[PDB]
């Protein structure tokens with residue numbers, strides 16, 4: 001079914017257009033995914049200059065179809081079942097004591113490449129907060145993404161809390177509320193409650209002078 005499109009390495013393109021408090025920026029990413037291992041390897045570049053928010057705050061927005069679903073849980077993989085026509089992911093990301101991002105992403109194949117096209121709008125950020133003040137460490141904690149079915153919208157929802165490390169030892173919470181809805185009208189898999197366990201490693205390309213992020217991520221379904 002759509003899962004058949006993910007048995008090997010798949011090239012990935014990510015394109016993001018953003019506006020946070022009137023700071024306009026764009027990000028382009030390239031890399032590949034291998035759902036057999038739940039593995040993503042991507043490099044993202046800010047093509048407009050300096051990124052006006054910290055890179056870690058964009059990780060969740062910057063392809064859950066690459067999650068490794070164990071064989072015994074394959075009937076719960078909504079993301080691949082929506083392919084190749086794709087799905088639309090919408091999120092509200094609420095930064096505790098600060099502003100919010102609202103995002104819309106279309107995830108679909110363009111020929112044999114998996115594309116994630118994103119619009120991000122951020123409002124009500126504090127000039128001197130952890131986000132616009134760039135007070136977040138360049139690292140990333142492991143988290144669970146809790147998925148539930150939304151049968152009346154033929155899709156899924158997700159809820160989860162990201163904890164961003166602040167440079168003083170504290171934590172910036174980012175509450176995520178997510179909806180995913182198929183683009184096509186073929187049948188999709190509507191899962192039982194489960195989660196995705198995600199681990200992410202952020203690094204820099206030593207030969208790259210543009211503002212950028214190298215990401216290695218592993219995503220594995222569990223909870224059934």
Ligand SMILES: [Mg+2]
Nearest residue numbers: 099123124125
């Ligand atoms: Mg207002």
